[PDB]
Design a binder for this molecule. Structure first.
Ligand SMILES: [Mg+2]
Ligand SMILES: [Mg+2]
Length: 91
């Protein structure tokens, strides 16, 4: 099931969509090249987001290292996405 994409839950829903994306990029880019970050109004309201890495190893390290990290006062809950974004094939 491990893939290039991590699905993040339990995100602070009071954070601005734009600021949230930027913060996610700052935090996760240290684990490897990020291809894309998915943060919509729908996802935001539910405290969810997706980060797509260029390599699966980067996704794995991110998942194992940032699990439970107090992001904006809330422990992040991270898992691999059920379906690896078709963006991988496209990009
Ligand atoms: Mg994008
Ligand atoms: Mg850990």
């Amino acid at each position: 099931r491990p893939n290039h994409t991590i699905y993040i839950n339990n995100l602070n829903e009071k954070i601005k969509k734009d600021e949230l994306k930027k913060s996610l990029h700052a935090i996760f880019s240290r684990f490897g090249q990020i291809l894309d970050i998915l943060v919509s109004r729908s996802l935001k309201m539910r405290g969810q987001a997706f980060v797509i890495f260029k390599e699966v190893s980067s996704a794995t390290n991110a998942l194992r290292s940032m699990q439970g990290f107090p992001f904006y006062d809330k422990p992040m809950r991270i898992q691999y996405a059920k379906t690896d974004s078709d963006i991988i094939a496209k990009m």
